[PDB]
């Protein structure tokens, strides 16, 4: 089952015109929310702009993230010194079976995981000296822990609940990859075969290579997103000078009923 | 810590000369988040270029997608030029149409 995760980032010295603080919100691999401190307002992204939604939804995303914003800038003061620093937080809930909500709150500083907010003991904590610095600075603030507890135990899974009921089509969206298999001589004696998958959702996809029907390995593979929320995948393999054409490509994806064979034709 | 960007160039839909399309630069796996990226058409900047939010992965490194609407053509090469703390000079990755 799905997740709702907020990606939070703040920086001690943004470029001019850059925000100090910005959040991307994600339902599964699909981004539904944008917020940055410059604009100071939460926005839907993609189809989610057109979701049939309770009228106060984006007011309440905005109010919560402004609180998160103040705390993140506050971390920097409390954090002794001149950095520059980058504070990242991964805050979200996962919905398993039984309608039961598991929570997550991990934090990273200058690209390193160093802190977390424990929900059982309502607490920020970590081993790093700077974990203690921010930790007590957040603890010593009125209401912080309570708002955090609220956001992840109630707000979060509620929001996930609402999107699963109001954005069913959006989450259940399936679009098969357009496929190509091509060849280019790599070196003397050799060719490079590249199997390529265009415009697919969901992101989960596997590609294999076959010689005459029997496995030849996966290529060397790469994934990436498109701008419309769809995805791209590609894989490449080295093969002999002129055989070469006793080869096909095998793609597996949820948007198909059965695996699809891609011939070099 | 510091992490150097991975760069991937490809088009939304399979490339066909004369047919309209989108071109993507996907820059990922990098830290810190400061980054500069241009798409190039035969050596020089594409003007109107959009990008997604600067977001990040389970491993905490950042990722970004740049894109622009375009019409491929027999006469045209494209690339992505990226600048970042971890590089001494801009890395340029040529768009392989098949990729």
């Amino acid at each position, epitope marked *: 089952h799905l997740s709702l995760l907020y990606h939070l980032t703040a920086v001690s010295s943004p470029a001019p015109g850059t925000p100090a603080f910005w959040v991307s919100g994600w339902l599964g691999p699909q981004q539904y929310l944008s917020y940055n401190s410059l604009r100071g307002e939460a926005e839907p992204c993609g189809a989610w702009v057109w979701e049939n939604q309770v009228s106060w939804y984006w007011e309440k995303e905005t109010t919560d993230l402004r609180i998160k914003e103040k705390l993140f800038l506050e971390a920097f003061k409390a954090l002794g010194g001149k950095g520059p620093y980058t504070l990242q937080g991964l805050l979200g809930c*996962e919905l*398993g*079976p039984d309608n*039961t909500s*598991v*929570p*997550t*709150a*991990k934090f990273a*500083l*200058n690209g*390193e*995981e*160093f*802190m*977390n*907010f*424990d*929900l*059982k*003991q309502g607490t920020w*904590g*970590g*081993d*790093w*000296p700077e*974990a203690l610095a921010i930790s007590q600075r957040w603890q010593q603030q009125d209401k912080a822990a309570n708002k955090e507890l609220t956001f992840l135990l109630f707000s979060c899974p509620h929001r996930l609940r609402e999107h699963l009921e109001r954005g069913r089509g959006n989450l259940e969206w399936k679009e098969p990859p357009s496929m190509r298999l091509k060849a280019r001589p790599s070196s003397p004696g050799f060719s490079v075969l590249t199997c390529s998958a265009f415009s697919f959702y969901p992101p989960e996809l596997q590609l294999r290579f076959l010689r005459n029907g029997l496995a030849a390995g996966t290529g060397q593979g790469d994934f990436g997103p498109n701008s419309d929320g769809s995805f791209h995948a590609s894989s490449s393999l080295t093969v002999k000078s002129g055989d070469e054409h006793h080869y096909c490509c095998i793609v597996q994806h949820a948007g198909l009923a059965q695996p699809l064979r891609v011939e070099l034709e | *810590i510091q992490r150097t960007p991975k760069i991937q160039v490809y088009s939304r839909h399979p490339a066909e000369n004369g047919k309209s399309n989108f071109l993507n630069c996907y820059v990922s796996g990098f830290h810190p988040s400061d980054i500069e990226v241009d798409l190039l058409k035969n050596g020089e900047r594409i003007e109107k270029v959009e990008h997604s939010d600067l977001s990040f992965s*389970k491993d905490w490194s950042f990722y970004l997608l740049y894109y622009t609407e375009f019409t491929p053509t027999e006469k045209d090469e494209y690339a992505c030029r990226v600048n970042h703390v971890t590089l001494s000079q801009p890395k340029i990755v040529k768009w392989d149409r098949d990729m």
Partner: antibody
Amino acid sequence: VPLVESGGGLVQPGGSLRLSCAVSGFTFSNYGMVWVRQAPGKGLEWVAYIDSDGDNTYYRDSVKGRFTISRDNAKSSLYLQMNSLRAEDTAVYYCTTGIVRPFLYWGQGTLVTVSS
Amino acid sequence: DIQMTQSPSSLSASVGDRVTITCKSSQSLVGASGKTYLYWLFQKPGKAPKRLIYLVSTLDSGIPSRFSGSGSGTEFTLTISSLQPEDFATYYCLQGTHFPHTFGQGTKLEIKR
């Protein structure tokens, strides 16, 4: 009182066992998790580690092909599937945290004894 | 494969005494934002381990303030300023910087009466 490990017991060489670690002390989803073991009346020994997500794992290489750490954040608990067991695997097995508070939370252990 | 080796393996000392335990790693342990992932654990017989000091010298909550650690590179020490009789246990040092992830053989600490 933060954890409880379970499912130890007596088994033959070759046999298999599944250790469970029920975390209720802290928010399990935040923590890399670790298995550590102690052969009866001897020093502590590191065994395995897992990502909080669940998609990165490490093992001592006297165990690589044979054991398998895993987690179900859903039931905030952690597992060790041990197969192809032999004599030296006899130990009390202890469940702890990895990043970001490595080795801070502990339980009573569970005894796994391997003999014919 | 990065060995931890403690000195001594065994020790009986008198209440009031100042105790010194050393931990020698075969390879340096700094390697982050100047964070050293060395740890001290202790274990009483029939009991589970507990964490004493984390990073190099940070006492865990409720660890009696007479316990302390220091060192930096490859040379580490646990120090009990004034021994008391509950201090009996086995102590271990633990490197947590590169897998594995290894313990010292332990120092068994008994109390002399």
